């Protein structure tokens, strides 16, 4: 059950917000800073520590946090609680011990992430989006490869933290404008269809093995230059038909007109026939213990 924590409990859990416990990607001074920690009951947690003045009205912070806290789903890194003591504003979620899509996709060591695992990620994150939308939390802020986490069993989950803004009013620059949907640039506002565009960028990441700007990818797609778009490290793991099917889904997600983008259920349905190696456990596919 969603619960409140004292700041002392959370400082104890994170060794006083020790810098080496940061597991997010922007360091200590960013709008989005997440620390790993461990509670007295041995439960491992992720703690997002909001900036001072980001959510100054604790009633508003709590309302938001509690709303996110009602969500419970296997495709999410779920929100367990919050803290709003002594000007701190913290979100406490399930710890994900196998790091991020970014680590395994962009910063691989043994070998590139397998196609089968990339497609499993895409499907499971689409399912996470379907769930969040189902529970009235259709807005998601800054979805990218750093918000896709891997659990104890190496299964992909969507971080719950992106369901809340980094600050109620502060302009965030947490996603470079190259990756934001066109309606954000016009209005400064996120809509349900905005996250679908972001999901399109995630598909581009998975297809290419890098965080390719949509403008550039869309040029390649217009040219049907699949060989320049797709990750050379995937060679021989996928049929041209399936590669193309996923590119076509990305193109739908990245449509200028928000109403033309797929709804989450359509993303899930489109992903099913592309799945590969269903019988293989995620830890084997991802290459973690
Ligand atoms: Cl506020």
């Amino acid at each position: 059950q969603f619960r409140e924590f004292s700041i002392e409990t959370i400082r104890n859990a994170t060794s006083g917000f020790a810098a080496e416990n940061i597991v997010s990607e922007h360091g200590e001074r960013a709008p989005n800073v997440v620390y790993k920690g461990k509670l007295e009951n041995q439960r491992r947690i992720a703690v997002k520590r909001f900036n001072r003045k980001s959510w100054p009205d604790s009633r508003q912070f709590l309302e938001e946090a509690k709303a996110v806290g009602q969500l419970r789903n296997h495709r999410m890194a779920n929100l367990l609680g919050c803290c709003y003591e002594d000007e701190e504003r913290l979100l406490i979620a399930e710890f994900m011990p196998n790091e991020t899509l970014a680590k395994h996709l962009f910063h691989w060591e043994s070998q590139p992430m397998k196609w089968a695992m990339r497609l499993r990620v895409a499907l499971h994150i689409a399912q996470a989006l379907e769930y969040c939308t189902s529970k009235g939390r259709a807005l998601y802020h800054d979805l990218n490869a750093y918000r896709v986490l891997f659990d104890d069993d190496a299964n992909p989950r969507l971080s719950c933290f992106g369901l809340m803004k980094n600050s109620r009013d502060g302009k965030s620059y947490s996603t470079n404008l190259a990756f934001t949907p066109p309606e954000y640039l016009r209005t400064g506002r996120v809509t349900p269809e905005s996250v679908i565009y972001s999901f399109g960028t995630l598909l581009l990441d998975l297809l290419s093995g890098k965080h390719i700007p949509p403008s550039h990818a869309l040029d390649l797609i217009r040219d049907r230059n699949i060989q320049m778009l797709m990750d050379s490290g995937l060679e021989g793991q996928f049929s041209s038909d399936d590669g193309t099917e996923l590119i076509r889904l990305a193109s739908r997600c990245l449509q200028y007109e928000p109403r033309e983008r797929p709804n989450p259920k359509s993303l899930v349905s489109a992903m099913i026939p592309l799945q590969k190696d269903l019988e293989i456990a995620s830890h084997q596919l991802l290459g973690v213990p």
Side-chain angles (χ1 to χ4, degrees), residues 49 51 54 59 61 131 145-146 164 166 169 173 218 224 226 264 282:
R49 187 181 192 197
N51 298 167
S54 60
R59 177 188 59 77
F61 181 71
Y131 171 75
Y146 288 97
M164 180 165 332
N166 297 323
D169 302 341
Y173 303 100
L218 288 166
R224 302 300 195 250
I226 189 174
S282 289

Side-chain angles (χ1 to χ4, degrees), residues 67-102 104-119:
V68 172
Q70 303 312 296
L71 279 58
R72 287 272 170 284
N73 177 90
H74 298 129
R75 305 306 200 219
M76 298 294 302
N78 299 101
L79 187 73
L80 302 173
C82 77
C83 172
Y84 54 92
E85 296 191 346
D86 293 339
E87 275 44 43
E88 296 279 351
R89 301 289 182 265
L90 318 175
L91 293 175
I92 293 75
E94 297 176 314
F95 179 65
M96 296 284 124
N98 278 302
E99 290 187 80
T100 64
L101 177 61
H104 299 290
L105 184 58
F106 302 147
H107 308 300
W108 60 269
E109 284 164 25
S110 48
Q111 59 184 297
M113 172 173 300
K114 299 175 184 92
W115 181 242
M117 199 64 205
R118 297 188 201 199
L119 301 162

Side-chain angles (χ1 to χ4, degrees), residues 62-102 104-164 166-184 186-258 260-264 266-279:
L62 183 60
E63 277 202 310
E64 268 293 274
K66 196 170 306 207
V68 172
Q70 303 312 296
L71 279 58
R72 287 272 170 284
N73 177 90
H74 298 129
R75 305 306 200 219
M76 298 294 302
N78 299 101
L79 187 73
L80 302 173
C82 77
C83 172
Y84 54 92
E85 296 191 346
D86 293 339
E87 275 44 43
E88 296 279 351
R89 301 289 182 265
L90 318 175
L91 293 175
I92 293 75
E94 297 176 314
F95 179 65
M96 296 284 124
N98 278 302
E99 290 187 80
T100 64
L101 177 61
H104 299 290
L105 184 58
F106 302 147
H107 308 300
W108 60 269
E109 284 164 25
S110 48
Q111 59 184 297
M113 172 173 300
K114 299 175 184 92
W115 181 242
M117 199 64 205
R118 297 188 201 199
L119 301 162
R120 184 173 295 179
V121 174
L123 171 62
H124 291 199
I125 296 305
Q127 292 173 316
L129 291 182
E130 176 173 359
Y131 171 75
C132 288
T133 299
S134 88
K135 299 296 297 193
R137 296 304 298 203
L139 303 192
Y140 194 97
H141 305 280
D142 315 296
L143 174 58
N144 77 349
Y146 288 97
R147 307 283 79 79
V148 175
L149 311 176
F150 293 94
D151 68 18
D152 277 280
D153 286 321
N155 286 132
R157 297 210 193 192
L158 182 60
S159 175
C160 65
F161 296 139
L163 297 165
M164 180 165 332
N166 297 323
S167 69
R168 193 197 71 173
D169 302 341
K171 194 153 191 106
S172 251
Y173 303 100
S174 296
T175 296
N176 289 144
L177 298 177
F179 299 92
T180 55
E183 68 269 16
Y184 171 76
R186 300 199 295 285
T187 67
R189 305 208 184 288
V190 182
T191 68
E193 301 78 8
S194 300
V195 68
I196 306 295
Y197 184 98
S198 301
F199 186 84
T201 76
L202 195 69
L203 297 182
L204 296 181
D205 294 347
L206 289 166
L207 282 159
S208 69
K210 68 192 176 189
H211 200 35
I212 185 171
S215 61
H216 180 47
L218 288 166
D219 284 344
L220 296 178
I221 293 165
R222 184 226 272 164
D223 294 345
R224 302 300 195 250
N225 199 342
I226 189 174
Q227 287 179 18
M228 275 296 111
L229 177 61
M230 292 199 68
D231 191 339
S232 60
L234 291 169
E235 275 197 359
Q237 293 186 42
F238 67 100
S239 73
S240 54
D241 278 3
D242 286 354
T244 295
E245 251 173 289
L246 198 61
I247 292 162
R248 286 169 176 184
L249 189 60
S251 288
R252 292 183 62 198
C253 293
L254 300 164
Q255 285 301 322
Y256 175 82
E257 287 297 335
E260 297 179 14
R261 298 176 195 151
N263 64 40
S266 299
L267 300 173
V268 171
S269 64
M271 289 304 313
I272 295 164
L274 312 184
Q275 301 305 300
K276 287 301 166 271
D277 296 325
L278 284 172
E279 82 275 24

Side-chain angles (χ1 to χ4, degrees), residues 55-57 60 168:
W55 283 95
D57 180 336
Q60 296 186 52
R168 193 197 71 173

